[PDB]
Amino acid sequence: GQQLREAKAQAAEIVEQAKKRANQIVDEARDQARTEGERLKAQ
Amino acid sequence: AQAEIEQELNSVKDALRAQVGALAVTGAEKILGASIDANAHEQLVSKLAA
C-alpha cells in the first residue's frame, strides 16, 4: 500500500514538472517574438 | 509586427500626401489672375447647367 501511494504521488509530480516546462516554453517564445517585433519597428 | 510596419508606413504616406494636397489648394493665386473675360465664360457655363 505504501509503494502504490508513493507511485501515484510521484506521477503527479512528473505531470506538474512538465506543466512548468510547458509554461516556460510558451512564455519565452512570446517574449522573444515581442523583442524581435520592437527591433523591426524601431529599425 | 509586419502588419503594424505597413500601417505605420501608410499613416506617414497619408499624412504627407494630405499636407501636399492642402498646400496645392492654398496656391489658388492663379485663379486670382482672372478678369471679366473669363467671368463671362463662367456665367455662360452657369447658363448651360441652369
Swiss-Prot record, chain B:
Location in or out of the cell: Cell inner membrane
Domain of life: Bacteria
Cited function: F(1)F(0) ATP synthase produces ATP from ADP in the presence of a proton or sodium gradient. F-type ATPases consist of two structural domains, F(1) containing the extramembraneous catalytic core and F(0) containing the membrane proton channel, linked together by a central stalk and a peripheral stalk. During catalysis, ATP synthesis in the catalytic domain of F(1) is coupled via a rotary mechanism of the central stalk subunits to proton translocation.
Subunit structure: F-type ATPases have 2 components, F(1) - the catalytic core - and F(0) - the membrane proton channel. F(1) has five subunits: alpha(3), beta(3), gamma(1), delta(1), epsilon(1). F(0) has three main subunits: a(1), b(2) and c(10-14). The alpha and beta chains form an alternating ring which encloses part of the gamma chain. F(1) is attached to F(0) by a central stalk formed by the gamma and epsilon chains, while a peripheral stalk is formed by the delta and b chains.
Family: Belongs to the ATPase B chain family.
Record's protein name: ATP synthase subunit b
Species of provenance: Pseudomonas aeruginosa (strain UCBPP-PA14)
